[PDB]
């Protein structure tokens, strides 16, 4: 399966840090698929080049040049700037089916068979379960649905100032109808529901296969003990001490080759 | 229908406020259903007496009693009181099919239209989506049902020590079979998600059919100015307001025959 993959996103350095743990955790877990990612010319060069050696291809995305399809629509509505580089995910015609994954995730076992699944698969968003969490979905590239989806962007917008209201409101069948399209909640695990959510996740949170974190603190904002092999600190920080081994195991000696 | 009904608990005086707002909720939107209500010794006179008139029927359940079919299993389990009193929903066989609905519930439209969903349909829980909350649901009364409930309470118990995790651990297909049995979120919108979520709510939260008070904090915990016909005190005190306005209307004068 050359033609199938996993694609992130990062339009900065502190993102690319995710993407770059991400991209391991999917290779630590043996996919058989294509790893992508699509960048700004705002991420370093520093940081392009470690990209360049975790993921099959690198992609550069700049919505600010005049040239981009989607620039007319990030002058009607300059708020959705991540959100319009997120949409050329769809651009992607080398691929016939993806696995779109936020950078701020996390990869604990292999997820090969997302890839049984059809456009829009996505898991349910805590919160407001009858919309589907936009970190984590399976889609086919394609110029007509990437054109809608810019349609509906600039008539539109979105009702939460980010892509997931706009995906919704595009894949608005997800909630009443194929209850395949309903990913298992464990293929995007909000760390939220994580620490908050102790009975429930106490009894299924052992499966876990992909962790998000989905608060104002990410991964790379907290302070990784090397010694103890630990962050500094609330209740269950094992899938932060996770992403900060792979990080300071594979991702940090990478960096120093720059 | 008159082998149909919306089933309700209360084992003390102050869930019975909810019982007999949300009964009234009920028949202020004309269902062509039965009422009933689940009741224990602890339950006042007075109270018991509003109940006979808001309900079409009022059933009296003591597992206090070494005389009940989940005494048993409650000196087992102490702690599960209110779970196996609840279960007895699945002894009214007189019903063919019943929604279940929490004392802290509110009905803001009719929803008659949950009687054309089968055993076990239920809304998503906002927290751990791939469980469904146990507040609301369409289930069929059934004495092999209960019993087997019973065992399960017995050697297992509940994973959340409520019902709830009782509930999913026996009906355990319904996060990955049969959209149908994924009731709408706005049959049983958390009130959290309400005042939490803001941009999913202002999008879909007009059409809530059903609000459920899950806090800390019941509406019957709130003081409520009469004059100004509003709660005292956060974003959308409306549902609380409507509340109040069907209590201080139609039960409070209902309270004063006694
Ligand atoms: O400066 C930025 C911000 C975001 N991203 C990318 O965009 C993704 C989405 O943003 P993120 O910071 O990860 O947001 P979340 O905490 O995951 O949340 C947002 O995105 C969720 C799913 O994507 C929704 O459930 C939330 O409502 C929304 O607030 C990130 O993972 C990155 O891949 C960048 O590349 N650069
Ligand atoms: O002393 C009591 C307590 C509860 N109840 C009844 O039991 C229902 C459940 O309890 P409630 O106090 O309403 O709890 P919630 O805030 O709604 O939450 C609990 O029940 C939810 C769904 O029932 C689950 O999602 C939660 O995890 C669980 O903590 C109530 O509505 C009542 O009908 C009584 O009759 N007497
Ligand atoms: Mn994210
Ligand atoms: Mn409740």
């Not at 050696?53 to 629509?73: K, P, R």
């Not at 950078?103 to 890839?115: E, K, M, R």
């Not at 809608?148 to 917008?157: P, R, T």
């Amino acid at each position: 399966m050359t033609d199938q993959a996993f694609v992130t996103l990062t339009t900065n350095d502190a993102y690319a840090k995710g993407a770059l743990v991400l991209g391991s955790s999917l290779k630590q877990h043996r996919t058989s698929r294509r790893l992508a990612v699509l960048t700004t010319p705002q991420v370093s060069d520093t940081m392009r080049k470690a990209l360049e050696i975790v993921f099959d291809e690198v992609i550069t995305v700049d919505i600010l040049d005049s040239g981009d399809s989607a620039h007319l629509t990030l002058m009607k509505r300059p708020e959705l700037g991540v959100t319009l580089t997120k949409l050329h995910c769809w651009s992607l015609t080398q691929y016939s089916k993806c696995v779109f994954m936020d950078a701020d995730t996390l990869v604990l076992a292999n997820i090969d068979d997302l890839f049984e699944r059809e456009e829009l698969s996505a898991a349910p968003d805590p919160g407001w379960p009858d919309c589907f969490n936009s970190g984590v979905f399976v889609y086919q590239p394609s110029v007509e649905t990437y054109n809608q989806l810019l349609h509906v962007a600039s008539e539109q917008g979105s009702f939460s100032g980010g892509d997931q209201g706009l995906l919704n409101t595009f894949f608005n069948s997800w909630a009443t109808t194929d209850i395949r399209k309903h990913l298992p909640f464990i293929y995007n695990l909000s760390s939220i529901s994580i620490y908050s959510y102790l009975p429930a996740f106490k009894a299924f949170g052992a499966n876990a296969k992909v962790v998000h974190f989905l608060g104002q603190t990410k991964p790379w904002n907290y302070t990784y003990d090397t010694k103890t092999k630990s962050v500094r600190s609330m209740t269950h920080p094992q899938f932060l001490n996770v992403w900060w081994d792979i990080f300071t195991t594979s991702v940090v000696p990478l960096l120093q080759q720059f």
